A paper describes a structure:
Two new chimeric Bacillus thuringiensis (Bt) proteins, Cry1A.2 and Cry1B.2, were constructed using specific domains, which provide insecticidal activity against key lepidopteran soybean pests while minimizing receptor overlaps between themselves, current, and soon to be commercialized plant incorporated protectants (PIP’s) in soybean.
Cry1A.2 is comprised of domain 1 from Cry1Ah (M22-D272), domain 2 from Cry1Ac (T259-E461), domain 3 from Cry1Ca (I467-D616) and the pro-toxin domain from Cry1Ac (E626-E1189). Compared to other Cry1A commercial Bt proteins, Cry1A.2 exhibited >50-fold greater insecticidal activity (LC50 at 14.51 ng/cm2) against SAW compared to Cry1A.107 and Cry1A.105, while maintaining significant efficacy on other soy pests including SBL, VBC and BLAW. Cry1A.2 exhibited no significant mortality and low to moderate stunting against CEW and OWB. The double mutant, Cry1A.2(E99C, R144C) (henceforth Cry1A.2-DIP) was identified using insect diet bioassays. The 2-way DIP competition assay results across all targeted soy lepidopteran species support distinct receptor preference of Cry1A.2 from all other insecticidal proteins evaluated. According to our DIP results on SBL, VBC and SPW, and the improved SAW/BLAW activity of Cry1A.2, comparisons with its Cry1A parent scaffold suggest that the Cry1C domain 3 of Cry1A.2 should be a major receptor binding contributor for these target insects either on its own, or via a receptor binding epitope nested between domains 2 and 3. Also, Cry1A.107 containing Cry1Ac domain 2 is highly active against OWB and CEW while the Cry1C protein and Cry1C domain 3-containing Cry1A.2 lacks significant activity on the two insects despite the presence of Cry1Ac domain 2. These observations are consistent with the hypothesis that the combined receptor binding domains (domains 2 and 3) in Cry1A.107 and Cry1A.2 target at least partially unique receptors across the insect species tested in this study, suggesting that Cry1A.2 would be insecticidal to these target insects even under a future Cry1A.107 resistance scenario.
Numbering used by the authors: 53 to 640
The structure:
Amino acid sequence: GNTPIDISLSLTQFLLSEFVPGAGFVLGLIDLIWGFVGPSQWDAFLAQVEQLINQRIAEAVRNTAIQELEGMARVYRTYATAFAEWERAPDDPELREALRTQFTATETYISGRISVLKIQTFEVQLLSVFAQAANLHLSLLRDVVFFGQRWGFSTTTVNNYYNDLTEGISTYTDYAVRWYNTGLERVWGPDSRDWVRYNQFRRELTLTVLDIVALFPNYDSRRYPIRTVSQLTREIYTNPVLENFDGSFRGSAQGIERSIRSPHLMDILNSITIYTDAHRGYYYWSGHQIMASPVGFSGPEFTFPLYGTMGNAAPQQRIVAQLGQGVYRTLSSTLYRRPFNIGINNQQLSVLDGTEFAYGTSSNLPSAVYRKSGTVDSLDEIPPQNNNVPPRQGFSHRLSHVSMFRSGFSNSSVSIIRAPMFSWIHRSAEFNNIIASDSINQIPLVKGFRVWGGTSVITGPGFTGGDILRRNTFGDFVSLQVNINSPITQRYRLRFRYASSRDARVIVLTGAASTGVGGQVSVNMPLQKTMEIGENLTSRTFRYTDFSNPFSFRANPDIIGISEQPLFGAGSISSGELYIDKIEIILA
């Protein structure tokens, strides 16, 4: 089993860590995807979303798509070797000229024939190979913008390729998120079964499409002259009780989706205290409590409201999640009791009767076990990024929350449903905000610890790899905690990635005060209007500041605050919205 979900996760790992242009990058794209000779690989890629919504692609359209993929891999392969021979004698004017034509030949082939992956009425099924190919096209355009003057191309030829890269990022992004959403809505229905297949689409295409799409902007090598590491803070969802049910509870799907928490700052799951109930010698997970900390463990634990019902047929069991790299895997045992319809006191049960919590770790640390283990295995839906090493080392996601979809009390109620919902954040969403020397640091604003009043966390547009922050008025956004590995004397610069339907002014303060409240203004920067009032959030509505003017922190676990300030003379009324996604920090 080498699923497309497997391949795509290892590719997410590659792009996230070793994003820097050179032979290592080309050799890497060959090894993970484009080295494959023949059709079967692309056949599997299409099959996954095809059987997901149970519509196969028309065969003429399907085979042309597969054969153009083959040709794309095939022209890239010859570019890649021509690239390597050049990097072995980089000044030779003949190797240069040989790479220059083999580049323009391969770019024209890929550029021109992506079309066959955007075919009308088959947009969703073709989405995952389109994401692969758009990502391949962008690798090439980054290459010329970065190596143009070494290769021998004119500065005018390169500036045109650069505009292609710009537009490519914006066009490809917008197509993918558009067909992601319309494919999602088409799967939605009102039943337990309809929600399962809805969520299956969301999860698989978040892994196979959106995560590669979130990294496209890093292909802009004029905007990112050096290394940069993005962070995927979005959470994908599993539910063993519902995903393993053979029937379907009717009209539930709207109730299930609401039981997921609303957009929120990123937290670190600390512990889960499970409560047990019983009925007729059948013991089950009836409710639980969740405790979390902010990013950086920057202060006091938050305890979530009770999930489910606080049973006592056994004593509570407190499972600590946050050991090593967190819980990477759950193996649950489901229990569906179907009696000969007695009722109320001979109940119908749709619940969990055990779960094993497996730790992500380079160690022998044993799993946590509630009652007993099971065979409903989350690793089957959230696979490893590296199958060459044991799962506890090559895992892709860490457990981030546990909610519950509840129905009935044990009371009356002929029927009881306790369906715990497991949230998975991608591994790249680090526990701390660490400012690296030597790279371009991305800190999504969802990594702060406090949202100030009148800033909302809004579900992200689809290409930021997480949620974002909105203000309707001017005011304070977040406070977040930063760690430097430099003397406090070291100087830094800062830029924003924002969306705004108005002009505004943005400031970053750096006097600490845990809780946030303090601060001294260190950075003052303008935000030009990026969209019209009431427009939708597409990639063209997002903009980068310049870098900021050197500043320094004033503590080494520092507490910085972001606020948006009224422009002088504007009269203190603000109309439109302000969106901030990311701040990025560099050195010197």
